[PDB]
C-alpha cells in the first residue's frame, strides 16, 4: 500500500521499519542515542517511522533555518499532535495555526525586559529561602538531593511571579502544588502508554471522548480550582501587570483557556529550571576549577555577597558561559519538531504534506564533526573569543524562530539568579552516592537515572 514506502520512494536513507512498530524498537537505548547513531550512520538527512508516522531527521544548518524560521507560518507551524490533551488543547505549546498565533502575541508581552525586572525583587526573596534551607542541610554534612531543593525554589518562583501568590513552598517541605506537578507527565516508552499512542495514534481521538489524559483529571482538578482561586484575588483588589493579570486583560481569551496556559507555565517553569540547575551543579561539582572561577566572578561583580540585580546578572559572562555549556550537554528538549502541513521543497529537498520534520538537538550538540571533544564539559567554548564560531542552528537549546521557547529569558534569569545566591554562600562537592560519570535515563525526559546527590559546604 504505502506509508512505510515513503522514504525509499523519496530515496532518503534510514533504518528499515518493522510493520506497525516502525523503528520504535530502536528507542531501547533512548532516542537521543538512537538519533546520535543515525546521524553517524546516515549523514545530514535521514527518515524513520514512529509506528506508521514518517519522521524526517535533518541536520543541515541552512535547512534548519528554513523550517524553524523562513517557513514557520507557511508550512511548519505546529508540532506533532500530542496525545490525549482534553481542554489542554488550548495550551499555547499544544495549540495550532491561528489559535496559536493569537495566544503567542497575547502571552509574549509577559517576558519583556521590564516585566522580568519587576520579577527581580520578587525572586530576590525566594533566593534567600533557598540558602537558609541549604544552610540547615550544610549542618548535617551528609548528602543533598538538588532536584528537591531546586524544584521547591522553582515552584515558589513561578507561582509568585506569574500569579502574585506566595505559596511558601520552601518553608513547606510537604506541598501539594509541587507533588502534583512532578506527576504531570510519566512520558516513558518503557511504559506502554505514550508508546501505545505514538504507535496507536488512532487511539488518540478514542481517548478524547473517554476524557482520559496524560494527567488523568488528578493534577488538573487541583489547578482547575487552585488557579480558579488565584483568579478571584485580582478580580477583587482594584496589582502589577503579570501573566495572571495579562490574561485577565484579554477577558478574546476564555476561561479554561486561561487555566490551560497557567498549567503549561506552572509545569514549564518547575521541571526545566530544576532539571537544568541540577545539571549545572553536577558539572560545577565534578569540575571544581570551574566552580571557583565562577565564585570569583560572582564575588568580583557582587562584593560582600551582594544581592544580585537584573543589570548585574547580565554582566556575568562566565556564568552565561557555564549555563550555555550545560545546556549544550543537556538540551532538556532533545529534539525540536515541526509538522509539515503542505508539500514543500526546502534547500533542494522534497518533503510531502504530513511528515514530521525533526531537528535532533541532542545529536547536533554532540556532533564529533562540529564540536572538538564533544562529551567534555568545556565552558570556554562559549567565550567572546570562541562564541561566534557557533552556529545558532546547530546550538539550539531553546529552539528557534517564532515557535521558540516563550520562557527563555525568564529561565536564564531565574537560573542565573539562583546559582548566584547558591554559590555566593556554598561550594558543592561530589560524594560516594554521586554517579560519576552521570548516566541519562532512557525515557522521554532528559534526566539523570540516579538523582544528583552532592555535598554542601559553607564559605
Residue 20 binds which of ligand HEM, ligand J9K, none (CB < 5-8 A, kind-dependent) = none
Q: Residue 286 Cβ, how far from ligand J9K at the closest point, in Å?
A: 22
For 63, the grid coordinates are 535547512
Q: How does DSSP assign 65-130, residue by residue?
A: HIIIIITTTTT--B----S--GGGGGSTTT--HHHHHHHHHHHGGGG-HHHHHHHHHHHHHHHHHH
Q: Which of 77, 90, 400, 424 contacts ligand HEM by CB under 6 A?
A: 400
The answer to whether residues 424 and 115 touch, using CB atoms and an 8 Å cutoff, is no
For position 412 contacting ligand J9K by CB under 6 A, the verdict is no
Q: Which of 83, 151, 399, 443 binds ligand HEM (CB under 6 A)?
A: 399
Range in contact with ligand HEM (rule: CB under 6 A) among 48-56, 182-190, 207-215, 392-400 = 392-400
Site for ligand J9K contains 271 (CB under 6 A): yes
* One residue of 267, 330, 371, 382 binding ligand J9K per CB under 6 A: 267
Q: Which does 276 bind (CB under 5 to 8 A by kind): ligand J9K, ligand HEM, none?
A: ligand HEM
Distance between CA atoms of residues 424 and 296, nearest Å: 9
Of residues 71 through 110, those in contact with ligand HEM by CB under 6 A are 92-93, 104
Q: What residue 302 binds from ligand J9K, ligand HEM, none (CB within 5 to 8 A, per partner kind)?
A: none
Least Å from the CB of residue 95 to ligand HEM: 8
Rg (CA), the chain: 22
H helices within 342-457, ranges in order? 361-364, 408-423
The whole-angstrom separation of Cα 145 and Cα 277 is 12
**How much of the chain is in helix, strand and coil states, percent to nearest 5?**
50, 10, 40
Footprint on residues 76-115 left by ligand J9K (CB under 6 A): 88, 93
Q: By CB under 6 A, is residue 264 in contact with ligand HEM? A: yes
- Nearer to ligand HEM (CB atom), residue 180 or residue 272: 272
Contact call for residue 339 and ligand J9K (CB under 6 A): no
Which residue in 406, 418, 419, 446 binds ligand HEM (CB under 6 A)?
A: 406
Nearest to ligand J9K of 159, 272 (CB atom) = 272
Q: Which of 32, 138, 223, 264 binds ligand J9K (CB under 6 A)?
A: 264
- Beta-sheet pairing, 350-351 with 53-58: unpaired
Q: How far apart are CA 225 and CA 234, in angstroms?
A: 15
- Does 379 help bind ligand HEM (rule: CB under 6 A)? no
Contact call for residue 7 and ligand HEM (CB under 6 A): no
Establish if 268 lies at the interface with ligand J9K (CB under 6 A): yes
| Binding window for ligand J9K (CB under 6 A); candidates: 33-41, 47-55, 102-110, 180-188 | 180-188
Which residues, at least 6 apart from 22, have a Cβ–Cβ distance to it below 8 Å? 4, 48, 49, 50, 51, 52, 53, 199
> Which residue's CB is nearer to ligand HEM, number 99 or number 299?
99
Query: Do the Cβ atoms of 163 and 182 come closer than 8 Å?
Result: no
Residue 138 CB, shortest distance to ligand J9K, in Å, is 29
Rule CB under 6 A: which of 123-182 touch ligand HEM? none
The CA distance from 17 to 48, in Å, is 7
Closest contact distance (angstroms) between CB of 264 and ligand J9K is: 5
Q: Is 213 among the annotated ligand-binding positions?
A: no
Out of 67, 329, 405, 418, the residue judged to bind ligand J9K by CB under 6 A = 405
Distance CA 367, CA 394 (A): 9
- Decide: is 276 part of the binding site for ligand HEM (CB under 6 A): yes
Judged by CB under 6 A, the residue of 57, 72, 178, 184 near ligand J9K is 184
Rounded to an integer, what distance in angstroms lies between the CA atom of residue 202 and that of residue 393? 34
- Residue 76: all three cell numbers together: 511548519
Q: Where are the alpha helices (DSSP H) in 235-316?
A: 243-250, 256-285, 288-301, 310-315
332 counts as binding ligand J9K under rule CB under 6 A: yes
Q: C-alpha cell of 433?
A: 552516592
What DSSP string describes 133-182?
A: HHHHHHHH-S-EEHHHHHHHHHHHHHHHHTT-----GGG-SS-HHHHHHT
**C-beta nearest to ligand J9K: residue:** 268
Candidate residues 336, 344, 356, 394; the one interacting with ligand HEM per rule CB under 6 A: 336
Residue pair 155/162 in contact (Cβ under 8 Å)? The answer is no
Q: Are 272 and 406 in contact (CB under 8 A)?
A: no
Cα–Cα distance between 247 and 418 in angstroms, integer?
27
Q: Is residue 195 a contact point for ligand J9K (CB under 6 A)?
A: no
Closer of 262 and 427 to ligand HEM (Cβ) = 262
Binding residues: 405
- Binding region for ligand HEM (CB under 6 A): 92-93, 104, 264-265, 268-269, 272-273, 276, 332-333, 336, 397-400, 403-407, 410-411
Binding residues for heme: 405
Amino acid at each position: 500500500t504505502h506509508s512505510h514506502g515513503l522514504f525509499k520512494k523519496l530515496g532518503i536513507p534510514g533504518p528499515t521499519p518493522l510493520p506497525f512498530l516502525g523503528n520504535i524498537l530502536s528507542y531501547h537505548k533512548g532516542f537521543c542515542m538512537f538519533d546520535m547513531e543515525c546521524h553517524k550512520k546516515y549523514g545530514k538527512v535521514w527518515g524513520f517511522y514512529d509506528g506508521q508516522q514518517p519522521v524526517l531527521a535533518i541536520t543541515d544548518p541552512d535547512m534548519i533555518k528554513t523550517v524553524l524560521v523562513k517557513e514557520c507560518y507557511s508550512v511548519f507551524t505546529n508540532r506533532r499532535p500530542f496525545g490525549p490533551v482534553g481542554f489542554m488543547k488550548s495550551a499555547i505549546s499544544i495549540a495550532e495555526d491561528e489559535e496559536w498565533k493569537r495566544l503567542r502575541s497575547l502571552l509574549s508581552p509577559t517576558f519583556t525586559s521590564g516585566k522580568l525586572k519587576e520579577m527581580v525583587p520578587i525572586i530576590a526573596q525566594y533566593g534567600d529561602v533557598l540558602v537558609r534551607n541549604l544552610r540547615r542541610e550544610a549542618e548535617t554534612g551528609k548528602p543533598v538531593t538538588l532536584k528537591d531543593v531546586f524544584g521547591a525554589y522553582s515552584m515558589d518562583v513561578i507561582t509568585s511571579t506569574s500569579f502574585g501568590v506566595n505559596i511558601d513552598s520552601l518553608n513547606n517541605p510537604q506541598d501539594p502544588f509541587v507533588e502534583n506537578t512532578k506527576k504531570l507527565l510519566r512520558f516513558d516508552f518503557l511504559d506502554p502508554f505514550f508508546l501505545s499512542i505514538t504507535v496507536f495514534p488512532f487511539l488518540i481521538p478514542i481517548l478524547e471522548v473517554l476524557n482520559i489524559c496524560v494527567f488523568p483529571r488528578e493534577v488538573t482538578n487541583f489547578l482547575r480550582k487552585s488557579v480558579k482561586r488565584m483568579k478571584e484575588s485580582r478580580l477583587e483588589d482594584t496589582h502589577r501587570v503579570d501573566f495572571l493579570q495579562l490574561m485577565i486583560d484579554s477577558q478574546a481569551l476564555s476561561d479554561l483557556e486561561l487555566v490551560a496556559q497557567s498549567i503549561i507555565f506552572i509545569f514549564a517553569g518547575y521541571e526545566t529550571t530544576s532539571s537544568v540547575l541540577s545539571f549545572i551543579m553536577y558539572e560545577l561539582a565534578t569540575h571544581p576549577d570551574v566552580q571557583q572561577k565562577l565564585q570569583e566572578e560572582i564575588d568580583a561583580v557582587l562584593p560582600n555577597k551582594a544581592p544580585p540585580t537584573y543589570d548585574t546578572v547580565l554582566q556575568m559572562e562566565y556564568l552565561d558561559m557555564v549555563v550555555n555549556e550545560t545546556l549544550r550537554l543537556f538540551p532538556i528538549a532533545m529534539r525540536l519538531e515541526r509538522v509539515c502541513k503542505k508539500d514543500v521543497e526546502i534547500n533542494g529537498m522534497f518533503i510531502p504534506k504530513g511528515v514530521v520534520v525533526m531537528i535532533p538537538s541532542y545529536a547536533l550538540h554532540r556532533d564529533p564533526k562540529y564540536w572538538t571533544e564533544p562529551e567534555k564539559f568545556l565552558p570556554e567554548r562559549f567565550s567572546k573569543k570562541n562564541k561566534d564560531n557557533i552556529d545558532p542552528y546547530i546550538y539550539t537549546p531553546f529552539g528557534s524562530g517564532p515557535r521558540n521557547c516563550i520562557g527563555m529569558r525568564f529561565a536564564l534569569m531565574n537560573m542565573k539568579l539562583a546559582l548566584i545566591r547558591v554559590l555566593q554562600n556554598f561550594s558543592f562537592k561530589p560524594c560516594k552516592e554521586t554517579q560519576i560519570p552521570l548516566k541519562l535515563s532512557l525515557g522521554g525526559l532528559l534526566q539523570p537515572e540516579k538523582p544528583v546527590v552532592l555535598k554542601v559546604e559553607s564559605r
